[PDB]
Amino acid sequence: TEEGKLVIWINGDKGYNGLAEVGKKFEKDTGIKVTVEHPDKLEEKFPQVAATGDGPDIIFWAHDRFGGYAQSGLLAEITPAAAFQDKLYPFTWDAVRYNGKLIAYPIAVEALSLIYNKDLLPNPPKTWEEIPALDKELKAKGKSALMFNLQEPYFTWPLIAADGGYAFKYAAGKYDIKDVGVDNAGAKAGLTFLVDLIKNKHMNADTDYSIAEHAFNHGETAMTINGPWAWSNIDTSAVNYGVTVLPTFKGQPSKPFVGVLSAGINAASPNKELAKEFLENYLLTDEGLEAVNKDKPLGAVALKSYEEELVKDPRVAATMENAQKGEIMPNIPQMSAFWYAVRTAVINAASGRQTVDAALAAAQTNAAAPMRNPTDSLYCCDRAEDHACQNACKRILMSKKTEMEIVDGLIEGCKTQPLPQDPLWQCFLESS
Ligand SMILES: OC[C@H]1O[C@H](O[C@H]2[C@H](O)[C@@H](O)[C@@H](O)O[C@@H]2CO)[C@H](O)[C@@H](O)[C@@H]1O
Ligand SMILES: [Zn+2]
Ligand SMILES: [Zn+2]
């Protein structure tokens, strides 16, 4: 990062060229150059490189990853005034609150929908259970009923959750990280339905994002499951399509995990005030979100003035219908382990490497695995009386060290007076 310029990371399936146009308008008005990048695996790279000080000023991702980033000390607290907060829907702010603090700007609400080819399939199925017979009919015409990305558990989750699968039990404003619901009867029933689709040759286990997108956009399969970002490529294609409610399973709505695309400010950025200018006054405007949306649709945007108009598009209305049948993702740090566990389980079950029951039993254990965290005490570093110690403290707590190594490193870098009288050490003693 350099002072006086902004670097932004956003995923490659989003409207990064539109976002670059917002960056050009920012540069035109203010002189600040904005560089938009879309690295591979950016949600994993960010915590890796925010440790070498080689991260972006601003990172975009769904809000579920941001609690972990914030817990690890990678994100700055944002400071929107009340008048700006009133411009966005309250529930979008809720998704970017962590430990009582706002840690990112909400951009847009994402939910998966059922996307279908009206020429192949004028009436889409209401139920998952009728898809096998639909596929049989379409196969006689040289087509298939449904293709979607089986390599990312985001896309299979709506089916896993339909009959009662869940990530973490939510009990009175709190998620219980030891109560994981990926191995209950409903999760098993949904994943078994998927595996049976594959066993019966109505889908194949290797289908990924590119294969499913190609197939739908070239008229080869009647349906796909995807989010708003995908509509742009379908529009460019020759396909007459609709976007509608996901099929039910066992008479229950499919329950997608709802993401809020969010923009966080790197805690290590020397440009936090510039990033705030850009996000509040350029991106989160009608004209800024339109520039991104026109490139790849955002979904249901967090900005009320724009969303009130945008929701008139039936595809956005359907996005919110599916969102209301699902659940907003937790943002707790355990979400990374949850997603990795379910990803392995879906892939292993779909490929036949494991049974559904064996895969999900391992997933429950892996998702609930406790993890040793020093960064619980990062707030104590801000009670340091000098900046050198403050920063030494932060590096030590973010360092994967043992408790002994943390204490010892703090003595080396942050002893300026007797420990019992130092607010940093008083905090660490009470906390760690
Ligand atoms: O598959 C696990 C994955 O799901 C979500 O990622 C979504 C993302 O929210 C969408 O905006 C779009 O990019 O598709 C992704 C799935 O490939 C979670 O947000 C993510 O943390 C999680 O790893
Ligand atoms: Zn292609
Ligand atoms: Zn093809």
Domain boundaries, the chain: 5-110+259-328, 113-255+334-368, 374-431
Nearest-atom number in ligand 1 for the CA of 11 is 13
Q: Which of 152, 208, 319, 327 has the most ligand 1 atoms within 8 A of CB, as the residue to mutate?
A: 152
Which residues lie closer than 8 Å to 142 by C-beta, 6 or more apart?
none
Task: State if residue 27 touches ligand 1 by the CB under 6 angstroms criterion.
Answer: no
CB neighbourhood size of 51 (10 A): 17
Residue nearest to atom 4 of ligand 1 (CA): 154
Reference 228, options 311, 162, 151, 304; nearest CA is: 311
Which atom of ligand 1 is nearest the CA belonging to 155? 1
Instruction: Give the whole-angstrom CA distance, residue 5 versus residue 223.
Output: 43
The closest alpha carbon to 256, from 348, 326, 162, 197, belongs to 326
Tokens of 44: 């994993």
Q: Is 299 in the pocket of ligand 1 (CB under 6 A)?
A: no
What is the CA(207)–ligand 3 centre distance, in A? 13
Beta pairing, strands 5-9 & 58-62: parallel
Minimum-distance ligand 1 atom for the alpha carbon of 154: 1
User: CB-side exposure of 249: number of CA atoms within 13 Å?
Assistant: 25
Q: Is 138 helix (H, G, I), strand (E, B) or coil?
A: helix
State which ligand 1 atom lies nearest to the alpha carbon of 14. Answer: 13
CB count within 10 Å of CB 139 equals 13
CA distance 298 to 306: 12
Atom of ligand 1 nearest to the CA of 43: 21
User: Resolution in A for the shown PDB structure?
Assistant: 1.7
Experimental method: X-ray
Q: Which residues contact 44 (CB under 8 A, 6 or more apart)?
A: none
**Ligand 1, atom 17: closest residue by C-alpha:** 152
Query: Does 5-110+259-328 match 113-255+334-368 in CATH topology?
Result: yes
CA distance 339 to 387: 37
The domain 113-255+334-368: what is its CATH number? 3.40.190.10
The CATH number of domain 5-110+259-328 is 3.50.50.60: no
Dihedral over alpha carbons 34, 283, 258, 155 (to 10 degrees): -40
Give the tokens for residue 240. 């007459």
Q: What is the enclosing helix (H) or strand (E) of 307?
A: helix 304-310
Q: C-alpha distances in angstroms, 386 versus 227, 313, 407, 415, 422?
A: 47, 54, 18, 11, 12
157 lines ligand 1 (CB under 6 A): no
Which residue, by CA, sits nearest to atom 19 of ligand 1? 62
Give the Cα separation of 317 and 310 in Å (integer).
Answer: 9
Write b or e for each residue in 230-264: b if 16 or more Cβ atoms lie within 10 A of its Cβ, otherwise e.
bbbbbeeeebebbbbebbbbeeebbbbbbbbbbbb
Residues in the chain: 432
Whose Cα sits closest to atom 22 in ligand 1?
339
In a 3-state reduction of DSSP, which class is residue 216? helix
> Nearest residue CA, atom 15 of ligand 1?
154
- Give the pair of three-digit tokens for residue 75: 């994100």
Q: What's the CA angle centered on 154, arms 200 and 320, to 5 degrees?
A: 110
What residue type is assigned to position 54 of the chain?
A: D
Residue nearest to atom 3 of ligand 1 (CA): 154
Q: 62 in ligand 1 pocket by Cβ < 6 Å?
A: yes
Calpha distance 119→146 (Å, rounded)? 14
Which residue's CA is minimally distant from atom 16 of ligand 1? 154
Closest-CA residue to 346 (of 123, 131, 157, 80): 157
As a whole number of angstroms, the distance between CA 15 and CA 292 comes to: 5
Give 312's DSSP letter. T
Instruction: For residue 152, give the nearest of 101, 84, 85, 227 by alpha carbon.
Output: 227
